[PDB]
């Protein structure tokens, strides 16, 4: 009943800053008993969890972890993971924006010149290779490998599984950043115009057009927790947006200069933003505190990414550098680059790699595996990062081994339980409650000159 890992499974509630009703008293007592039983029994599943997370540990004081080479990892790990660590050398079209499907089964690469390829990177099956000879910028899958949206010269296009064009969106005028919201079925679009557009993929209907009013959108990320969009502008300002409010939900002053990249944890708690002022900044999202401010990077961080197990992958051109346990509150988790004299209270890099020829275009962790796919000027490279993936997925949220029938039925079922775009709030648990107006107690309709003293009476 005690369960040393309950507070992961606990659930916050409302507080005022007991009752005389017998029936209501016993009803609330049954509700508290059921909540305790449910938390305990849900937290006892960690026995049933099949796999264990990966790691790499130094076992010596001369053996630092950032100086461990990718060939040495590929020798030290098994043949299946060594074959997952792919490398495509696609030289002639531009730097390749990488994208993985939400289970790690499909890869979607876009060249800057025109070359968009959707493929099953772990078999050898490509299912779309289309050369759209205008400058493409980004792409994403929608709810499947079966549809993907590409952001072209101006218009965003939507292609089916084999690459036939389904849609040319006449809105979404100049996208540079696309991201799909999978529980809400919303393709979110931002770019050189100062506008943020939410487009419902299922109905086909443009849900929202929002003026950023801050020029072109330099970075864009999605909170996986509550589906609000963090856009980074040329002010050094991140703004958190929802498709209901025509104003940003929050505006944070992250950096000086512009904001080069944003990444959010999948728990929706931490956000790493890199500015062009050579400054990485780790942010608390829920309480909006600034946790860490790594200033004076040697060159501006062009990308950040956060794995499912909380690694932090920063990329500064040729270099990729990953820190472990950097998204924590304490000042001993501030990511350093060296430990001055061997200080154990300095978060040196967990591992680093140098793409010596080129400058990396973007970063993306492969979802349920221990790999980091970085797309760069001459194609794709996966890196075996051992701490970097949820070993125990849930197979009824999203399954890496899913079949054709399972894809069909899961598509219909998630389409059926698509969440409305109005339910996107800054916290997800605020659509069962009562208003923050409409008084917290329910109402019971019962509650619904001594002369002048004489001259008074006149």
């Amino acid at each position: 009943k005690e369960r040393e890992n309950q507070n992961k499974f606990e659930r916050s509630t409302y507080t005022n800053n007991q009752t005389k009703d017998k029936k209501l008293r016993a009803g609330l007592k049954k509700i508290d008993e059921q909540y305790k039983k449910a938390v305990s029994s849900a937290a006892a599943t960690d026995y049933l969890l099949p796999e264990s997370n990966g790691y790499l540990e130094p076992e010596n004081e001369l053996e630092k972890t950032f100086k461990v080479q990718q060939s040495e990892i590929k020798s030290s790990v098994d043949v299946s993971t060594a074959n997952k660590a792919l490398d495509l050398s696609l030289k002639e079209f531009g730097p390749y924006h990488i994208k993985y499907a939400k289970n790690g089964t499909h890869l979607l690469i876009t060249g800057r010149k025109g070359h968009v390829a959707s493929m099953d990177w772990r078999k050898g099956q490509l299912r779309a290779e289309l050369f759209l000879n205008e400058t493409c910028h980004s792409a994403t899958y929608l709810q499947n490998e079966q549809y993907f949206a590409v952001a072209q010269k101006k218009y965003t296009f939507i292609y089916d599984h084999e690459g036939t064009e389904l849609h040319r969106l006449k809105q979404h005028i100049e996208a540079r950043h696309l991201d799909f919201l999978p529980y809400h079925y919303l393709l979110v679009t931002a770019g050189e115009t100062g506008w943020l557009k939410y487009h419902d993929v299922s109905t086909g209907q443009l849900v929202s057009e929002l003026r950023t009013k801050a020029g072109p959108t330099m970075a864009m990320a999605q909170n996986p927790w509550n589906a609000v969009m963090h856009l980074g502008h040329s002010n050094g300002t991140v703004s958190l947006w929802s498709p209901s409010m025509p104003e940003p939900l929050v505006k944070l002053l992250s950096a000086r200069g512009p904001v080069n990249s944003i990444a959010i944890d999948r728990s929706g708690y931490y956000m790493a933003t890199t500015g062009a002022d050579r400054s990485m900044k780790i942010w608390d999202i829920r309480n909006f505190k600034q946790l860490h401010s790594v200033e004076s990077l040697p060159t501006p961080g062009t990308n950040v990414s956060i794995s499912d197990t909380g690694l932090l992958a920063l990329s500064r051109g040729p270099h990729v550098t990953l820190w472990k346990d950097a998204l924590k509150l304490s000042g001993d988790s501030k990511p350093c680059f060296g430990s001055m004299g061997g200080n154990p209270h300095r978060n040196t890099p967990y591992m680093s790699h140098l793409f010596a020829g080129n400058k990396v275009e973007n970063l993306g962790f492969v979802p349920f595996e221990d790999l980091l796919g970085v797309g760069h000027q001459t194609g794709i490279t996966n890196l075996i990062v051992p701490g970097a993936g949820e070993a125990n997925y849930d197979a009824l949220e999203l399954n890496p081994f899913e079949t054709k029938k399972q894809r069909q039925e899961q598509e219909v079922r998630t389409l059926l339980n698509k969440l409305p775009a109005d339910t996107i709030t800054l916290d997800p648990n605020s659509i069962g409650s009562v208003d923050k107006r409409s008084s917290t107690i329910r109402l019971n309709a019962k509650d619904l000159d001594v002369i002048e003293e004489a001259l008074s009476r006149f």
């Binding site: 549809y147 389904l166 849609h167 040319r168 006449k170 993929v201 299922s202 109905t203 086909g204 209907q205 069909q408 598509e411 219909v412 389409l415 059926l416």
Partner: protein, 182 residues
Amino acid sequence: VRKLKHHEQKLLKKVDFLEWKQDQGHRDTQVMRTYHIQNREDYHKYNRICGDIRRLANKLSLLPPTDPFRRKHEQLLLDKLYAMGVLTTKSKISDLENKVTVSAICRRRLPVIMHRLKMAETIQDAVKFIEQGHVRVGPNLINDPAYLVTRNMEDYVTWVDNSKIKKTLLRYRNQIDDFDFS
């Protein structure tokens, strides 16, 4: 996407992944499958022209019917749209909203007049021939299918000489002269 069940047809009806409201019935896709347009955005760079001529025909309708600036510019526009062959006659200015079509401004393209005067036998083979570089309007070769013609140049659409399909039709009719090198 799954040919949904009945409680399914009822629960969500406006869902349609294939055809949205702003597709306008996919008329761009339909007319470029008809007249076989190579790249995208040709439809909309014709539709901007259609919208511009109906907008300035609207504001020429706005101006009073007596001034020579208005009447000279509407007869000039009508004669230029006759001279590029978008129309077939010099009729009413009501035809500048009834008869100007993105279809007809595709009818003046070079492969479709080629199929019209039976130089090719289908518009696809016409685009085959003019990407292979066989035809010319007057002196100069035509490489792209986006060159639409005017009303004067439907008479000098001819192949080049040394075009071997011209040589095959000459030796079909065995009028094949070879002093003229084709």
